[PDB]
Design a protein around this ligand. Structure first.
Ligand SMILES: *[C@@H]1O[C@H](CO)[C@@H](O)[C@H](O)[C@H]1NC(C)=O
Ligand SMILES: *[C@@H]1O[C@H](CO)[C@@H](O)[C@H](O)[C@H]1NC(C)=O
Lengths: 49, 49
């Protein structure tokens, strides 16, 4: 109900670092394919955790 | 092969993750089928297989 939201700021978004941290049961992606997530730059990103 | 449960969703044409990037990598024109079933009764030892 009171979900958080944060800026990500300057970053390299490599999910490979998270691989031996936990296995994501749900990783559905919309408008962007997961395979292309490593070939992209994002002007704005929000977490919504 | 045998995988972790939370990773069965990674056995699909377009997927990213340790299985879909370093291990198996189903093609984009697979034209087959993926059967997967829980085998915690078979591939699990009381001390961990
Ligand atoms: C991260 O890598 C280390 C080194 O092998 C491993 O022991 C650890 O279990 C890995 N993390 C997870 C969550 O498996
Ligand atoms: C997450 O935080 C805990 C506690 O600080 C730490 O033990 C663990 O290694 C951290 N995991 C990762 C992937 O950074």
């Amino acid at each position: 109900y009171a979900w958080n939201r944060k800026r990500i700021s300057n970053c390299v978004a490599d999910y490979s670092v998270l691989y031996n941290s936990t296995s994501f049961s749900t990783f559905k992606c919309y408008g962007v394919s997961p395979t292309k997530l490593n070939d992209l730059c994002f002007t704005n990103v929000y977490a919504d955790s | 092969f045998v995988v972790r449960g939370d990773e069965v969703r990674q056995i699909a044409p377009g997927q990213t993750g340790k299985i879909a990037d370093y291990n198996y990598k189903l093609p984009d024109d697979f034209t087959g089928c993926v059967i997967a079933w829980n085998s915690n009764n078979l591939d699990s030892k009381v001390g961990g297989n």
